[PDB]
């Protein structure tokens, strides 16, 4: 018998998952508690705040001694990790670090989560999760003081990286016979042999807090903090990852829930370096290259954000008391905000259409008495793991005018352009890996500022 816990029946993955869970932090009605089944006190200090999460509110930590969350483990699950296998998982959101902060604070390692033995004059064995610039570190120290680490260096392209302001899922497995393995969003990101380490008792406390960080602006966000009593297999890591990916409220680009009456810049997943722009009022919209920021000495670059048109989302039919969140299947109206005026986005009756099937959207098209088709459904049709959205346009008899996307061509006498359209064409390509109808909604956020 080895180190993974209770073994009986070969059952569902979902069963194994629950039956090997030893701590599980959920947040409900603003209380942070453990729902694993065991009880473990969770003490929330005065300055540990709460923010929009992946499936409810999540824990937010700033850089002062008041911003902390501690779990005292129950006397049942208090040994476990001494010579045993274990797995740690959590969702994490770390803002994008400015080029000044990297110049200044890039070599500064500091803890965010840990459980390491509290001694009279020192600190002993256990584990820690920490960060250093744009690197994510996992650390193990045994009783003899021997150390093994996993250091993951994030991607230089910040529009696509894991440590640059979107929600990402972290999972870390430990097999005291082969290895420590780090995964991000279900994909093995690095590893380390831990054969030869001895005892790893752990402190009776698990501390969530910023420790030894020299930057008083740094902050992180953490959610569903969870511990298993075994080393999870790749299959199980995956079912755990998507179990959180409920479909009901849509998501903006950072992976927070989508909202009505708030400004968003659109970016097509298929060409993430173009922004959307406007020909003229009553006219159409087309794509253009976004300006970029690059800094080879710091090892960083990205397409810049916040240029283009600002879109706003309104309930097709007015609410009554209701939430501000947009669910999938929700029918909305889509406006463009330009020159202190809001113009509706839509398609008219016998308006221009590449090959009479791809209808070219117009912004604020007004006319005598000419039907302007604007009813849209905002849904998630594909690619669960990506914070993207699809828009379906209807006409006045509830027929499909199709999905919002783009098609290349050339109007009047402007130059060739990728122009915005609606067509039922996408409906036959839904299984492609990349597809021109997937869109990102991007709001201004304090965690991403352009250099």
Ligand X SMILES: CC(=O)N[C@H]1[C@H](O[C@@H]2[C@H](O[C@@]3(C(=O)O)C[C@H](O)[C@@H](NC(C)=O)[C@H]([C@H](O)[C@@H](CO)O[C@]4(C(=O)O)C[C@H](O)[C@@H](NC(C)=O)[C@H]([C@H](O)[C@H](O)CO)O4)O3)[C@@H](O)[C@H](O[C@H]3[C@H](O)[C@@H](O)[C@H](OCC[Si](C)(C)C)O[C@@H]3CO)O[C@@H]2CO)O[C@H](CO)[C@H](O)[C@@H]1O[C@@H]1O[C@H](CO)[C@H](O)[C@H](O[C@]2(C(=O)O)C[C@H](O)[C@@H](NC(C)=O)[C@H]([C@H](O)[C@H](O)CO)O2)[C@H]1O
Which residue ranges make up the site for ligand X (CB under 6 A)?
Answer: 354-355, 357-358, 405-408, 421, 423, 425, 436
Comparison of 424 and 450: residue with beta carbon closer to ligand X = 424
Rounded CA-CA distance 451/304 in Å is 9
Comparison of 238 and 432: residue with beta carbon closer to ligand X = 432
Least separation, in Å, of the C-beta of 8 and ligand X?
Answer: 49
| b (16+ CB within 10 A) / e for 72-96 | ebbeebeebbeebbbbbbbbbbbbb
Comparison of 295 and 352: residue with beta carbon closer to ligand X = 352
Least separation, in Å, of the C-beta of 398 and ligand X?
Answer: 21
Q: Which two tokens stand for residue 441?
A: 């909604």
Least separation, in Å, of the C-beta of 310 and ligand X?
Answer: 24
Rounded CA-CA distance 363/284 in Å is 6
Q: Which residue's CB comes closest to ligand X?
A: 407
Comparison of 273 and 295: residue with beta carbon closer to ligand X = 273
Comparison of 42 and 401: residue with beta carbon closer to ligand X = 401
Comparison of 301 and 425: residue with beta carbon closer to ligand X = 425
Q: Is 129 left (phi over 0), alpha (psi -120 to 50) or beta?
A: beta
Where do the DSSP E strands lie in 142-184? 147-153, 168-174, 179-184
Q: Is 56 left (phi over 0), alpha (psi -120 to 50) or beta?
A: left
SS3 of residue 236 by DSSP: helix
Least separation, in Å, of the C-beta of 355 and ligand X?
Answer: 4
Q: Residue 376 belongs to what H/E stretch?
A: strand 375-379
Least separation, in Å, of the C-beta of 151 and ligand X?
Answer: 37
Q: Give which of 76, 65, 94 is closest to 34, Cα–Cα.
A: 76
Least separation, in Å, of the C-beta of 440 and ligand X?
Answer: 16
Least separation, in Å, of the C-beta of 64 and ligand X?
Answer: 49
Rounded CA-CA distance 297/303 in Å is 17
Comparison of 243 and 410: residue with beta carbon closer to ligand X = 410
């Amino acid at each position: 018998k080895n180190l993974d816990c209770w073994v009986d029946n070969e059952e569902d993955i979902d069963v194994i998952l629950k039956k090997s869970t030893i701590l599980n932090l959920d947040i409900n009605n603003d209380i942070i508690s453990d729902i694993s089944g065991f009880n473990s006190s969770v003490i929330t200090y005065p300055d540990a705040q709460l923010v929009p999460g992946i499936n409810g509110k999540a824990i937010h930590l700033v850089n002062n001694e008041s911003s902390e969350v501690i779990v005292h483990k129950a006397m049942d699950i208090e040994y476990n990790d001494m010579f045993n296998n274990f797995t740690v998982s959590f969702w994490l959101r770390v803002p994008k670090v400015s080029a000044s902060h990297l110049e200044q604070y890039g070599t500064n390692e500091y803890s965010i989560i840990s459980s390491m033995k509290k001694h009279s004059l020192s600190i002993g064995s256990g584990w820690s999760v920490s960060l250093k610039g744009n690197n994510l570190i996992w650390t193990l120290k045994d009783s003899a003081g021997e150390v093994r680490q996993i250091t993951f260096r994030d991607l230089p392209d910040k529009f696509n990286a894991y440590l640059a302001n979107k929600w990402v899922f972290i999972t870390i497995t430990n097999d005291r016979l082969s290895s420590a393995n780090l995964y991000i969003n279900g994909v093995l990101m690095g590893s380390a042999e831990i054969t030869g380490l001895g005892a790893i008792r752990e402190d009776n406390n698990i501390t969530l807090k910023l420790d030894r960080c020299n930057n008083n602006n740094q902050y992180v966000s953490i959610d569903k903090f969870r511990i298993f009593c075994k080393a999870l297999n790749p299959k199980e890591i995956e079912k755990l990852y998507t179990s959180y990916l409920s479909i009901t409220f849509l998501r903006d680009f950072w992976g927070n829930p989508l909202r009505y009456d708030t400004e968003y810049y659109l970016i097509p997943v298929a060409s993430s370096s173009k922004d959307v722009q406007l020909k003229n009022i009553t006219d159409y919209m087309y794509l253009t290259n976004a300006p970029s920021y690059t800094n080879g000495k710091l090892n960083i670059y990205y397409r810049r954000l916040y240029n283009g048109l600002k879109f706003i989302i309104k309930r097709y039919t007015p609410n009554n008391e209701i939430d501000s969140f947009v669910k999938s299947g929700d029918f909305i109206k889509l406006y463009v905000s330009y020159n202190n005026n809001e113009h509706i986005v839509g398609y008219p009756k016998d308006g221009n259409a590449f090959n009479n099937l791809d209808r070219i959207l117009r912004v604020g098209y007004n006319a005598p008495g000419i039907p302007l088709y604007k009813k849209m459904e905002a849904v998630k049709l594909r690619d669960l793991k990506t914070y993207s959205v699809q828009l379906k346009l209807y006409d006045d008899k509830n027929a499909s005018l199709g999905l919002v996307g783009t098609h290349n061509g050339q109007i009047g006498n402007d130059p060739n352009r990728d122009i915005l359209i609606a067509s039922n064409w996408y409906f036959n390509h839904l299984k492609d890996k990349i597809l021109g109808c997937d869109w990102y909604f991007v709001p201004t956020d304090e965690g991403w500022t352009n250099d």
